[PDB]
Amino acid sequence: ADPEELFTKLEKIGKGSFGEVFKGIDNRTQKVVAIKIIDLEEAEDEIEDIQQEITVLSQCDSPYVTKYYGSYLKDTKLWIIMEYLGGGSALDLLEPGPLDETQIATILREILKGLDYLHSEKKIHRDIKAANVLLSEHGEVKLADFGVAGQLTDTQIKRNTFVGTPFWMAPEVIKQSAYDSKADIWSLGITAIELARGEPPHSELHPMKVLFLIPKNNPPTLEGNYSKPLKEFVEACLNKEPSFRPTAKELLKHKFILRNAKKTSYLTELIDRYKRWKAEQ
Ligand SMILES: Nc1ncnc2c1ncn2[C@@H]1O[C@H](COP(=O)(O)OP(=O)(O)NP(=O)(O)O)[C@@H](O)[C@H]1O
Ligand SMILES: [Mg+2]
């Protein structure tokens, strides 16, 4: 199985902490794919995380989670084949300017369907933030970046690992207590603020400072010119006690969602705005 023979790299579309991501195509069947290529010698440090990402990805089967088309090994390089999402991340789409509440609600609804799927599979994402929410060019919204996702089982009904991105981390995760899927609900509340304001609470502070602030301080609220149901949606998520947070399933029925969420195809307006912006940068 030679991925240099099976796939054609068309353009580089991303560079993360390790490896490189390419826009590619299956030379058989001509489906366009995202290809994450990692040098396993250069990232021997991360092989455990890479293994987990691939494992979780292979076990997911949902229109709200980035599809996985397998991994290929060429010499020391691992080729991870995924669904290609060329619309940009929700964070990318914030670059040109603010979202309206119709866009915020539509994006949050789709993130919620993704979380409801994961949580029904007893999986916890643990790194929900707008950068890890990816859109297709025609506005479909999917969860990405499963490198630190956790699996609950019948025996392991809670997780304890300190993991995530600090601005978005739930207080119970930070204070490595036993936690479950409600940790993602906190992160969603922070992401809702991020979608509304362009950045999470404490964004200007040092990450290590935030790590003691999040357990100590009052939970964040959304202030300013936002509808009260949006402010209430945020408040519902950002409860320091995880058992008082609603499930993703309940949140799908929240008034801010029901009132403001529209068809995902309307998000092409946002995707075009990003393309216009990018062309004049
Ligand atoms: N399936 C995909 N389709 C399109 N773009 C993607 C896809 N997966 C990842 N990307 C983008 O490619 C880049 C590299 O992604 P990745 O290697 O997963 O690092 P990252 O987690 O986004 N950043 P980091 O947390 O600093 O390592 C990012 O800008 C992603 O948004
Ligand atoms: Mg990441």
DSSP letters spanning 144-210: ---TT-EE--SS---B----S-GGG--HHHHTT--B-THHHHHHHHHHHHHHHHSS-TTTTS-HHHH
39, 45, 92, 127: the active-site residue? 127
> Is residue 116 located within the same domain as residue 215?
yes
Please give the Cα distance from 153 to 123 (Å, whole number): 9
> Is residue 265 located within the same domain as residue 141?
yes
Q: Is 180 among the catalytic positions?
A: no
Residues 180 and 170 sit within 8 Å (Cβ to Cβ): no
Please give the Cα distance from 265 to 166 (Å, whole number): 32
> Is residue 175 located within the same domain as residue 263?
yes
> Is residue 246 located within the same domain as residue 115?
yes
Residue owning the nearest CA to atom 15 of ligand 1: 16
Ligand with an atom nearest the CA of residue 142:
1
Residue where one domain finishes, among candidates 69, 84, 99: 84
Q: Which residues are annotated as a binding site for Mg(2+)?
A: 132, 145
Resolution (A): 1.9
Q: Long-range contacts for 15-18 (Cβ within 8 Å, ≥24 apart)?
A: 17/46, 18/42, 18/43, 18/46
> Is residue 258 located within the same domain as residue 240?
yes
Beta-carbon count within 10 A of 137 CB: 14
Beta-carbon count within 10 A of 161 CB: 12
Burial of 19 (0-12, 13-18, 19+ CB in 10 A): buried
Please give the Cα distance from 87 to 273 (Å, whole number): 11
**CA–CA distance from 178 to each of 157, 162, 237, 256 (Å)?**
9, 10, 18, 30
Please give the Cα distance from 234 to 265 (Å, whole number): 25
Tokens for 254, please give them: 């929240």
